[PDB]
Design a protein around this nucleic acid. Sequence first.
RNA 1: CGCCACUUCAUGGAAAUAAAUCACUCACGAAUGUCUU
Length: 132
Amino acid sequence: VIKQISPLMLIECKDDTSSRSIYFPLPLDDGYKVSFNETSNEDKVFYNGIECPIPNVYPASRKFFDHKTYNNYLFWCTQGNNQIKKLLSDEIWISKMQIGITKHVEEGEDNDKSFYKQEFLQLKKSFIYAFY
RNA sequence: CGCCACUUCAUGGAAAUAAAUCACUCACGAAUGUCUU
């Protein structure tokens, strides 16, 4: 009976529980302009041997792509009635590392080798998962 | 030469002062760094 499942969504539920904000990962090109100048014979990238035009990139605010300041991969985004709201992944997900062992019950087992660390994630109080 | 006793019974000063006030050592050691379905 299952026919169609939507991609899992990150939904924010506010105190005024009448509207929900859907959060998406920030596009990797956000805040930057990519042109691909086509004057030809200028410069061609070879991605593992395939022809491709050169990706001229500028911030949408010139200078070039400074990968020392590139941080779009750390941000999640949602629609606002203005610009795009950027939320850090830190502010959404809380992470803790848990140490675990199996208590050595003697008269048996070669299991001193039971020793591990696990990562557990907690969602912020206003954030839930959803899909259709 | 004889005769004969009274008076006085602790005041002042010092009443604690300096030195050391914790020292050295150990401040985590060994096992497990994944295992069984």
